[PDB]
């Protein structure tokens, strides 16, 4: 069951068995940033995967479990210690001289991402996704959701953890 | 096992011994 | 200010009222997919408030989004006002009103009634026992064990006139509610006969299946023991105010 | 690693929730405070405050 | 039962509270929001009445003097009383505005049935119960409605054999009848509440605040959005009704029609029947009564009125058949040398003028009809007003004749210019 | 503490903690007090060991701080048979079920907690349970990879095996997946046994995968023998024998029992015409290459590197706009081989689909030119470089390695690539062209294709 693990976005997710893709993007840009999620599935579940991602992380503003924290920490371990391939070290490298002026060690970034905790995780998440607007692309079949395709009040509550979430678990 | 489920389980089989002491108690005492 | 605002939009170009474009606009997403190509000649949109309806606030969106809750907050809690009033209705409909005190003052002289007696009188048509006590008699109650007391809150009000305090208390058994025994040899109280609930002279729960003393009565005696003024405890009930003006 | 039992993650997510809650507790408390104000008045002065026993003279 | 084929919604508490929690309502104006005023007038008249409830002992004679005594010793419970009765009129006047609206939309389409009989009904039932309401007050009005209300229930028996009496005992107003009448007063008060749920899950098939098709497709979500909208549109209209009733009722006044309900049943014996009339909302069918002085015929044209305002959607709507019908028409055979007519098609509502013009003849007859007591006493020695007769004639002849309605004068107009054109550009 | 409990109630920063200043450091600058070491990289040592019984174990020597990898290799596709076709399909869909030990609930968490990964990959011939992880979380890891690729399969395991397989079926004939062509290729070369059995199994089986008929497999085909333990990124080659000792040791010595044994592979020169009334027409045209054993498979992989880099697209796809898309086949078994060409293009030209495809793979024969070669090596070796600088696949390679040669080969990759001559290709080519043909089509005008005889006089 979905219920049975520590993932609670792949909890919801596999609860739904037409939406096929989904991937978290992190875009960081010299000035501004984009961070959100992509999702690509069956039309009939666009209500869900429109307001899915907005509510965990608007949940991660008031309460994030111990088992996310410690997950998260050890893929960020994994991923930094599997950086293995020279194009890819390189490219990271010169992205990182580029925005920095600096090249970030992996021990520094350990050290760094390890020092997270309940309190800062929420406290950064209603700094940056508590109650704050959205920007929303929605590509393909609109008949279900052309009723509604405008900055309504349910767009905008989406951003509360558990407050507007009762157009995500509708269907 | 846990300290505080077996003292609910104790207090369960005790509080009704604990009832009957108090109800024999009211009557000696109603008896004068 | 508002003035100034209205000036400013006194001067605004539009067609019959309505600011609407006065020639076709055609607007393309240059990140439309491929597949769309070019758009048709037809002329969906006739007014341009997408950008037109703009305060261009990118910067400190989130002061206008607390402007529109704030706005929010005061259309819900004007609406809650009314319903607040009207749940105000509803609850005291069913919760009744008192809206006054019926009178309950009486005068009983107790001069008349030698020392050491009990008499009973009609207050509010219930019995009522008036008595009066010697300092002997006081002085032998005070000593005694206070084991057979089982009343640890319950106090005893004395009077101080007539050269003899003079006592006021409810006669009715706490139990249910029968009428004890006016005076025992034992003891000159008060002895439920009907179950056998014991009181001592000022009513108190002495060795007793009884769990309560008999009620006091409010009394102020005035006149050396000739006016004794007797009115029920007032307790506050609200609102009081019957007419604004 | 860290293999928390599901039980401890109801129970934890529980918590939160039942705290998110009862911060509402005071929010309907002040509005049955508001009204209904008369009938606090007097269960105040009439349980908690008993009235003075002495009567007037007159 | 196998010609019940099912329900359109399965009202149950969770299906009732998804549905209403992802409904999308249409960007709309005032006019076509008196069914919101409608249900809401409803739930506080639910609410008053159920106040009103705990006061009023079934006793015809301690009714008045309870009434009396309880508004003093007891707050709000005149306050829930008046609230009652100015309900009822709001209630009144929210209805007839929303059916009006709802005939000048001409939404008697095939698709529009379930949505309109549903409706009706309502209707129909949220008559009863204000007559029980009547009852209750247990003054010469309530006698003479009681009087009038088993009078006509005996007119379908002949008058023969007392079928009457299982709830008009007597024909009186006494403890059995006032006991058994408030009771169902209650009971299909509380279930009017239902039919209305009913009524505005099946209306949402295809709804419409005007008749034409307006292309947009984003829908405003109803629980807020819509529902700010609605509260402030009766806001409004209560604000516009107070200042009404203000202005034109000054606050002591000389002959009212409240004079009438005076009299206390059992107290006072004697009524004067000089002055006899209802309130405003009954008063049209008792003006009715007055101009038709014969008792069946006045008991049909009142089953017809309601019956016919039932069945709209049957004489004047598709039927399915695509306005290949055929009509039976007595002159306009002879014009055409045909027996019978095809169904007109083009009956837009905002662009003919006919329409316009025959619906707001019938909405004008009817508020004369309401405008006053035709005053029985000597209505008839002296000819009697012939804008009443007019009016109600028109009101029988526009709901039930589709020649008002979906008229043959437009349709045959339109293809002649139509014929005329391609003859002259081929 | 009090202080974080208090500021963790109210959503307040605490600006004088510690952890906010780390958090909250400016990117551009190191956080203060912290720096960590500095080391070089170290030449890597491989190491291989035999226990009492079969298994065998290989250890890579660290050769810079990282995620240890773990891996076990099992010889047991080729070792089914029509019984129990299709085993180790449903053994990849529940790779992680496994009820002796820990549980699928607890080891799916295991894996999420770890913060690594744990895949199953199966070919014909060999079946590979590969992990990465850190080190501290190695041991618990390593507990799951040896049960769920060596405890018996259990009746949920089968019963959900079943299931997903159905899927699984379902979803590659919705597809069209090239695996489905390849199975039908397999199929008509060797004939529905050996390396002809199909790599998702066979269709009509799928209800027959009971957990009986799995644990029968597993009993016939997994022994101590055929088990390869193998670890990369280890401080100590005797830390990770204790661990996996710890584990397989008390797997009994397969010694004195008869032996499932492989049955040579024998070749088949059939032809599958199939009419499927598709717009596209797919053709396949393989040959019977050498076998791992043979010094020439490097040639073969420099011919298919001739062929995906750089002749294929500009004599085919550049040229001719109906070739939907044309690639070499290159399939190396320990007891055989197949190479050839795959091409799909429009069906009303099949012909000219046939022809020029099959003088392509002739011109190889006819001989390769001096810079056609170097590209092609040069593209080799940074195709094979790539997948070896990546730890994971340096693994499984020297797993595969230590198993089919014996030793370990992917050190000296280049020098064998660059020892590679035109006319070695050459005359490997034209050797394998007189095998004789296996031809498989599919499209909406199959019916007309040249004779299989034709076929051949054109290869000759
Ligand atoms: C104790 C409380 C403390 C807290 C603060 C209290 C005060 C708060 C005041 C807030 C503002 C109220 C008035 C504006 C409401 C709208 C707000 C808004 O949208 O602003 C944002 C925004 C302005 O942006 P902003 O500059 O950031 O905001 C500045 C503030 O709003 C501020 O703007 P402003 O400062 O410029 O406001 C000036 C205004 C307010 O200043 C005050 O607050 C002072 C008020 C004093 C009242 C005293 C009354 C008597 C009692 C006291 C007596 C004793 C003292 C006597 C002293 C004598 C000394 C000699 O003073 C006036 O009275 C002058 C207004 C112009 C004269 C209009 C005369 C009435 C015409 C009515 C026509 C209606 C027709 C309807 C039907 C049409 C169809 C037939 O507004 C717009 O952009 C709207 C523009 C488009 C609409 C224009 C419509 C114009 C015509 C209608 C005017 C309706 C209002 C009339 C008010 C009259 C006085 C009550
Ligand atoms: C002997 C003692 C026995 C016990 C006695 C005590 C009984 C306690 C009952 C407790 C009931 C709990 C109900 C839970 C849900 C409540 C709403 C909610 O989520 O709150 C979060 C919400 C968080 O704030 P927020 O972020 O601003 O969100 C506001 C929105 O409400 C946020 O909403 P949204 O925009 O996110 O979406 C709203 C809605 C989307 O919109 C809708 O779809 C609305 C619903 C449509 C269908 C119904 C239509 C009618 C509307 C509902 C009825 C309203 C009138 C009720 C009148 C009652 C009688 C007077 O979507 C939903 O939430 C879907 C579910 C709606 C609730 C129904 C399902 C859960 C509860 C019931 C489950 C069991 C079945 C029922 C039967 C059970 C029988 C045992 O909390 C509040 O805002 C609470 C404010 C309270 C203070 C203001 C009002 C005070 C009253 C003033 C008048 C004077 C009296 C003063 C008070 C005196 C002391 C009491
Ligand atoms: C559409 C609604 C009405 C139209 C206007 C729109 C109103 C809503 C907009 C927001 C308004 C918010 C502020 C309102 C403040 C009002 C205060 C007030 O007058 O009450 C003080 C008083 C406070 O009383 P008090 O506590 O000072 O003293 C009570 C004791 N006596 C009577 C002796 C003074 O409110 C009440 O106590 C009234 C309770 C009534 C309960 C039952 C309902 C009766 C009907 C009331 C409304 C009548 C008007 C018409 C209603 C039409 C719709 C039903
Ligand atoms: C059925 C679901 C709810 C329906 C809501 C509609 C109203 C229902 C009212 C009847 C049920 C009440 C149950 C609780 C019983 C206590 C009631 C009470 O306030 O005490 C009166 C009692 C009696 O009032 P009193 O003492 O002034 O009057 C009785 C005595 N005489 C007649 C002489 C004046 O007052 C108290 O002692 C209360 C003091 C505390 C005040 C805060 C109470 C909080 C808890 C109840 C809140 C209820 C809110 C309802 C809002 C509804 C909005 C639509
Ligand atoms: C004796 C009482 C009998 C009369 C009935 C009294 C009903 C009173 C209802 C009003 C007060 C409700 C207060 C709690 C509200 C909790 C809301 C909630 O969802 O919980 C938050 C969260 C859940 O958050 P959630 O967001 O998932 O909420 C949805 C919850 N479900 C799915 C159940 C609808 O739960 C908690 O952790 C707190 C639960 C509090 C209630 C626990 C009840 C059982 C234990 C205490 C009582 C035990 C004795 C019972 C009597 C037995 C007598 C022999
Ligand atoms: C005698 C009367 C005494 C009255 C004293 C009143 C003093 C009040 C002083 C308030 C100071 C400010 C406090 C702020 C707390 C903020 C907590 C917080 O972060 O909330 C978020 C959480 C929920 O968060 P959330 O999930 O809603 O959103 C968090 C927001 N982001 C995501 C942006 C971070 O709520 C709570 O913590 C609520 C629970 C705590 C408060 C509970 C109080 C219960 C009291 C019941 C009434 C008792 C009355 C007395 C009874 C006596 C009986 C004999
Ligand atoms: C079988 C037949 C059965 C009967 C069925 C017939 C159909 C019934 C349909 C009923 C529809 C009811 C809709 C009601 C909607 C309105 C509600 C409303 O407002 O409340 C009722 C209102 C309020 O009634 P009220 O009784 O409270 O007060 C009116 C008092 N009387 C009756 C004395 C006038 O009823 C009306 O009176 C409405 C009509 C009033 C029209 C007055 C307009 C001004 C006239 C000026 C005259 C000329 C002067 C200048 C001359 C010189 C210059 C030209
Ligand atoms: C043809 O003749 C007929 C009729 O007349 C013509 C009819 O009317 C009818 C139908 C009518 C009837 C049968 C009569 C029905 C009458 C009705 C419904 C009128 C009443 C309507 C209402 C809405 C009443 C509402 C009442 C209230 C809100 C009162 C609230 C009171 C209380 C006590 C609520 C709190 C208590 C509870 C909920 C009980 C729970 C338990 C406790 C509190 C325990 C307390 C004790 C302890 C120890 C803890 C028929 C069928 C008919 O055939
Ligand atoms: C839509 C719902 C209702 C309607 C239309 C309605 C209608 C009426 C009407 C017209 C009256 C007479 C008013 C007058 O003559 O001035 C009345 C009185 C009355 N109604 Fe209703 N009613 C409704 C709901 C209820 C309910 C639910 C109850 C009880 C639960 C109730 C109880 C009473 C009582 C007790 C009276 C008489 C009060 C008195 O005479 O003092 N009503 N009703
Ligand atoms: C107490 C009586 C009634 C109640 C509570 C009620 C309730 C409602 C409500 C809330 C709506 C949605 C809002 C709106 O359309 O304005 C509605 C719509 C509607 N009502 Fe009623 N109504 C009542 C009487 C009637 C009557 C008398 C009719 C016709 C004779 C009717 C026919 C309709 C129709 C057809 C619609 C849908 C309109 C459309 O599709 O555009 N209803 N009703
Ligand atoms: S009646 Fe007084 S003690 Fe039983």
Redesign the interface.
Known sequence: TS?????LIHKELGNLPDVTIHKTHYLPYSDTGLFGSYFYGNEIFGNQMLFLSQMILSEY???I???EI??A??????EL??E????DIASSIATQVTY???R?????VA??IS??????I??AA?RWFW???LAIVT?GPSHGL?????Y???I?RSTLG?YGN??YY?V | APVFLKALRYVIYSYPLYVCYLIKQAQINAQG | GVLSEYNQRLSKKLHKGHLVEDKPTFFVTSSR?GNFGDHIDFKVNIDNWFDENRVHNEHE??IR?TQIYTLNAIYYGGLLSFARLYAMGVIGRLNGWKRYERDTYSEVDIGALPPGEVMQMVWNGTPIFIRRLTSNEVKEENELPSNTLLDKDKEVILSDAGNTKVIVVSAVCTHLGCIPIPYLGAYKGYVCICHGSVYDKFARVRQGPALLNLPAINNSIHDEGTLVCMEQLKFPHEPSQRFWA | ??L?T?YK?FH??NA??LK?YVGYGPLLLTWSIWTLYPALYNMIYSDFIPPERGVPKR | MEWNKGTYMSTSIKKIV?YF??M?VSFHDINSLFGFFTFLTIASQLVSGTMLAFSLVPEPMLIPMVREEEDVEDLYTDDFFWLHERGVDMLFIFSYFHLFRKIYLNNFEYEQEAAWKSGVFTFLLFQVVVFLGLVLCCTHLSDITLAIAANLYDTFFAGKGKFYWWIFTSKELNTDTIIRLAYLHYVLAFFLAYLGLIHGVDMHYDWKNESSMDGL?????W???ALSNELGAMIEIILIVMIVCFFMYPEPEALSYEFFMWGDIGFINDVRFLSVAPHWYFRPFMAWLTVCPFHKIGLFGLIYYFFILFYQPVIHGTNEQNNYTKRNVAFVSFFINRSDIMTPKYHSVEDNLLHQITFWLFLCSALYVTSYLPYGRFYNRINGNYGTLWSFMYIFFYLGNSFLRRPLITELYLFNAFVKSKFLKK | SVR?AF??FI????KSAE??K??T?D?????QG????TAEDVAAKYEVTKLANGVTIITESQTFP??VDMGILLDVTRDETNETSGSLLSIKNTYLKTVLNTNE?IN??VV??????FEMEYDQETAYFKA???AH?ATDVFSMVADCALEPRSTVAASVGVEKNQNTHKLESYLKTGELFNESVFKTAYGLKGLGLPLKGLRGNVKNLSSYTLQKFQLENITPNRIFVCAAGVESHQEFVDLVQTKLAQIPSAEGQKTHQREKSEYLGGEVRNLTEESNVTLALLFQSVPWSSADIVAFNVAAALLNNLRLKKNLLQKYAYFDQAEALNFHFTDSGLFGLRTSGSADRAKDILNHSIAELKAIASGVNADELLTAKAALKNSVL?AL???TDRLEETVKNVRTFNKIQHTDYVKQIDSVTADQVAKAVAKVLTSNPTFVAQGSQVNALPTYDAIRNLLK
Not at chain 1, 3 to 7: L, V
Not at chain 1, 146 to 150: D, K, L, M, R, T
Not at chain 5, 217 to 221: D, S
Not at chain 6, 34 to 37: D, I, S
Request: net charge positive.
């Open positions: 219920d049975r693990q520590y993932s503003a008031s309460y479990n111990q088992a410690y997950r920490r050890a893929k960020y371990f994994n210690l599997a293995q391939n020279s194009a920095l002026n600096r970030v060690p992996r021990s520094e050290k760094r020092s997270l905790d309940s309190g800062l929420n406290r209603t109650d704050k607007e590509w052309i009723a509604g395709s405008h309504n009040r349910s905008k558990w009762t157009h509708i | 997919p969106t989130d989004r | 690693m860290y928390p599901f993650l934890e997510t939160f929730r998110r | 998804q929690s992802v999308t497709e984003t829908e405003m979500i629980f807020d959005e | 974080k500021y963790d959503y307040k920063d605490d952890t906010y780390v958090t450091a990117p551009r600058t190191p956080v912290f720096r960590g070491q990282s995620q609930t799916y968490g999420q907690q770890s913060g690594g990964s990465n992880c850190l979380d790539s600088e990546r730890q």
